[PDB]
Write a sequence for this structure.
């Protein structure tokens, strides 16, 4: 699972890897070092290596000669089984058969790389819990590693002596890893996963359970500024934190069967970017829309794609069914000469029907970063189903990359939050962009984090990657790029200072 991804390898190194340890059908993915933000699919075929560009501009993974995907895991799963119709110019099939596995452990949640014996004990003593563990580089034995495991009962600081921390040396000799006896492993991940399944037992009988990695991402909101400083800059920083998050995407390959159904195929903007069955919005007014409920784990959201001409009516059905009263559009109808969303609302002062739904554009206000549209939504034949829907259209998202300052986003979401809150029993806030995962994901996560701070003040804990992972288990690929990942941190930092300045 995600071992075919090699986060710190060069193009030539990848070639040599595939040529020396691979066979025809072998492959790996890697970040493009030439095209930052983008990726490369390196495949061995007919005795040599081909490199295949995978572009990600913030909306999705665009495989050259292939299709658009929500995550690299989903792309690889796609080809490595059903509908592996990957080809090139000539029309030749390119087979993805043998994942060439990576041995670098940096993006393992339990691997902290560069860290000392004292700080390690600090983390394990405070955040630590029964079965919490971690692996750091040995400073006293270069090339070697230390595994540290907390066992006992309760968590956090204790003095009852009912808990303890054990340290196990991991020797690296001749490119393989062991704990001083027994099996030797080709990588630290193999070793760790072996001892998770077969726990080490001490003579006196303490079983060293490797239950959960220690959390090293959670911070107190007050000190986000300091955390950003360290992650910015050897010890792991932003890049490793993000790559560690990406690695966990392989836990999220849930079914999206309803999306793949023939009847619903043309209801998806992008054919392979689908909602999870278990969180999709079911329309019980067919029953299909490309949307998922996102629930923070009071205010919820619906992340959805931009409407197609044949899904406009379904979009409005969804809005009515869910009692949604606020809609956040983060896209222009067309960007870089590409359709991203059809106009699904009437011109100002006009009234339109969309199947059984009827919508009136009452009034448009404009601001710097956005236009607000007051819409009246009702069901035809029923002159009491009228509800006001507020459509916030954010227009200042740069066509390439992310905004240089988060202040417009923050002011926008602040305004969106007050609107939602003013309307008792309003359902989820609808958020959409092209595929409903890039910007949508970014806006939603930022909104989630700020709400924690708005309600609990400067003195609360936030965990960006964990919030993102929680959101990703509800819609595929939410938050697409490391760029957006940094932008989330910047936005929460910026919010904090504007809070304290007042």
């Amino acid at each position: 699972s995600r071992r075919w991804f090699h986060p710190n390898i060069t193009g030539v190194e990848a070639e040599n890897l595939l040529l020396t340890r691979g066979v025809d059908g072998s492959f790996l993915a890697r970040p493009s070092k030439s095209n930052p933000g983008d990726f490369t699919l390196s495949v061995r075929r007919n005795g040599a290596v081909t490199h295949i560009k995978i572009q990600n501009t913030g909306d999705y993974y665009d495989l050259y000669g292939g299709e658009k995907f929500a995550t690299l895991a989903e792309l690889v799963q796609y080809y490595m089984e059903h509908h592996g119709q990957l080809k090139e110019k000539n029309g030749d099939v390119i087979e993805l058969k043998y994942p060439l596995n990576c041995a670098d452990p940096t993006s393992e949640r339990w691997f902290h790389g560069h860290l000392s014996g004292k700080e390690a004990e600090k983390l394990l003593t405070e955040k630590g819990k029964h079965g919490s563990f971690l692996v750091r580089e040995s400073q006293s034995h270069p090339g070697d590693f230390v595994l540290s495991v907390r066992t006992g009962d309760d968590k956090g600081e204790s003095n009852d002596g009912k808990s303890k921390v054990t340290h196990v040396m991991i020797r690296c000799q001749e490119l393989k890893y062991d704990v001083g006896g027994g099996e030797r492993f080709d990588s630290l991940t193999d070793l760790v996963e072996h001892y998770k399944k077969n726990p080490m037992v001490e003579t006196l009988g303490t079983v060293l359970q490797l239950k959960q990695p220690l959390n090293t991402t959670r911070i107190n909101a007050a000190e986000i500024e300091s955390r950003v400083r360290e992650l910015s800059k050897v010890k792991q920083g932003f890049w490793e934190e993000f790559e560690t998050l990406q690695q966990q995407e392989c836990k999220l390959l849930y079914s999206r069967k309803e999306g793949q159904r023939q009847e619903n195929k043309n209801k998806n903007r992008y054919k392979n970017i689908l909602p999870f069955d278990h969180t999709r919005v079911v329309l019980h007014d067919s029953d299909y829309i490309n949307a998922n409920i996102i629930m923070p784990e009071k205010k919820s959201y619906i992340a959805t794609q931009g409407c197609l001409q044949n899904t406009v009516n379904d979009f409005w059905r969804m809005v009515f069914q869910e009692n949604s009263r606020v809609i956040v559009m983060t896209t222009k109808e067309v960007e870089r000469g590409k359709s991203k969303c059809v106009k699904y609302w009437p011109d100002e002062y006009a009234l339109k029907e969309y199947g059984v739904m009827r919508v009136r554009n009452v009034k448009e206000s404009a601001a710097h970063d956005y236009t607000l549209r007051e819409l009246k939504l009702s069901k035809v034949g029923q002159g009491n189903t009228e509800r006001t829907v507020w459509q916030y259209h954010f227009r200042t998202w740069p066509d390439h990359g992310v905004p240089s300052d988060p202040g417009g986003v923050l002011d926008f979401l602040e305004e969106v939050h007050h609107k939602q809150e003013s309307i008792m029993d309003a359902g989820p806030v609808v958020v959409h962009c092209s595929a409903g995962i890039g910007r949508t994901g970014t806006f939603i996560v930022i909104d989630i984090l700020i709400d924690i701070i708005r309600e609990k003040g400067v003195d609360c804990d936030i965990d960006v990657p964990k919030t993102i992972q929680m959101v990703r288990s509800q819609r595929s690929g939410m938050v697409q790029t490391e760029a957006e990942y940094r932008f989330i941190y910047m936005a929460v930092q910026h919010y904090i200072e504007t809070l304290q300045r007042r």
In short: The two ends are 47 Å apart (CA to CA). The chain is about 25% helix and 25% strand. The first strand starts at residue 26 and ends at 31. Residues 75 and 221 are 36 Å apart (CA to CA).
